[PDB]
Amino acid sequence: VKNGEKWMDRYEIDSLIGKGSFGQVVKAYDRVEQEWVAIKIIKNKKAFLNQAQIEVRLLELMNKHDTEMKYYIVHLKRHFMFRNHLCLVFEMLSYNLYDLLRNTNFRGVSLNLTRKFAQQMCTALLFLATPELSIIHCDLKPENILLCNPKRSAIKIVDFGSSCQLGQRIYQYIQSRFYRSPEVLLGMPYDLAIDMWSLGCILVEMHTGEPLFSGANEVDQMNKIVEVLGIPPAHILDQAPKARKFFEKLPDGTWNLKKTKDGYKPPGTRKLHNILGVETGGPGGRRAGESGHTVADYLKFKDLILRMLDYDPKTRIQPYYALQHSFFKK
Numbered sequence: 001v002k003n004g005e006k007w008m009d010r011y012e013i014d015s016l017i018g019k020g021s022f023g024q025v026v027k028a029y030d031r032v033e034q035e036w037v038a039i040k041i042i043k044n045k046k047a048f049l050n051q052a053q054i055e056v057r058l059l060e061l062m063n064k065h066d067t068e069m070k071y072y073i074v075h076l077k078r079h080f081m082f083r084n085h086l087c088l089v090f091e092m093l094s095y096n097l098y099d100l101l102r103n104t105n106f107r108g109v110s111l112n113l114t115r116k117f118a119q120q121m122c123t124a125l126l127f128l129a130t131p132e133l134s135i136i137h138c139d140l141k142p143e144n145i146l147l148c149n150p151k152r153s154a155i156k157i158v159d160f161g162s163s164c165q166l167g168q169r170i171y172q173y174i175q176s177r178f179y180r181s182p183e184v185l186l187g188m189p190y191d192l193a194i195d196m197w198s199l200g201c202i203l204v205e206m207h208t209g210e211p212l213f214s215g216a217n218e219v220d221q222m223n224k225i226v227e228v229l230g231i232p233p234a235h236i237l238d239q240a241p242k243a244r245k246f247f248e249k250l251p252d253g254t255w256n257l258k259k260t261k262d263g264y265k266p267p268g269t270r271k272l273h274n275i276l277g278v279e280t281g282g283p284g285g286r287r288a289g290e291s292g293h294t295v296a297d298y299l300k301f302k303d304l305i306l307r308m309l310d311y312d313p314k315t316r317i318q319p320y321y322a323l324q325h326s327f328f329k330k
């Protein structure tokens with residue numbers, strides 16, 4: 001698009017912030033408001049235009065709800081069509097939580113900073129669950145959570161490009177694989193609980209520095225989930241279109257892993273207890289003796305994460321109840 005380019009006697013393009021599947025995000029000066037903005041420029045192809053039109057509708061739907069809880073979502077200032085590209089104008093934010101992890105050399109941030117991110121993200125999910133909204137983000141991951149300010153720990157969620165209201169589902173294959181819920185891996189109709197699953201994955205990663213479940217493909221993904229959480233419950237597998245991609249039903253109505261050639265730990269034996277280092281000074285023992293990282297602080301964190309990683313989307317913890325958990329009590 002080129003630095004120095006002027007649009008509509010209003011925006012002056014400075015530089016490329018980021019590239020997406022959708023098109024590109026540029027830094028631009030708005031002469032009317034007298035402020036810098038992020039312009040998300042959608043590719044001039046029907047597929048990307050039509051999905052971005054849904055993104056604009058969902059962001060405008062959120063903006064018309066003035067509540068405390070709306071201010072953890074990136075603000076869409078406005079949108080327009082230019083040279084046959086849909087253009088979404090956002091507030092400027094800072095760098096993403098993946099960059100934050102990269103900057104720790106993938107050793108993770110403190111339990112105290114993790115808690116601050118968790119509380120903001122739980123508040124965002126509570127907003128999206130407002131009945132009149134019922135928005136599923138569908139692509140929650142560190143790259144999609146941005147700091148408001150490089151000096152501060154305020155965050156906002158970005159990228160509602162995959163997002164849908166409950167009962168407006170388009171695609172069965174959604175979420176980034178590391179953050180994909182068992183219900184999506186199993187080809188089941190999904191609801192807002194898929195974001196809470198992603199969040200559990202994100203919070204463990206923010207503290208250990210490494211993805212909790214880094215599958216190379218869906219079969220590897222489900223195997224890595226099973227290593228930590230065991231075989232999913234029969235009542236879920238009995239209703240799952242894709243259960244037999246991963247599991248086999250026994251004579252007695254019981255399920256087991258499909259095994260391929262080895263060259264995984266037995267189901268439920270890679271304990272989150274050990275991944276977090278609850279009784280061993282935190283991830284890789286690197287938090288030994290630091291304040292805010294006692295066994296008791298760890299056990300509360302472990303408890304909240306295991307509720308976020310319930311296999312059953314029905315009983316998985318919901319945003320309001322996550323905000324009341326002891327992990328967030330002084």
Ligand SMILES: Nc1cc(-c2ccc3occc3c2)cc(N)n1
Nearest residue numbers: 017038090091092093158159160
């Ligand atoms: N909705 C949305 C927003 C952004 C966005 C908004 C403001 C920003 O400031 C700095 C980077 C950035 C990205 C990116 C995408 N892919 N989707």
Ligand SMILES: [Cl-]
Nearest residue numbers: 098141142211
């Ligand atoms: Cl990642």
Ligand SMILES: [Cl-]
Nearest residue numbers: 139162174175
């Ligand atoms: Cl997606």
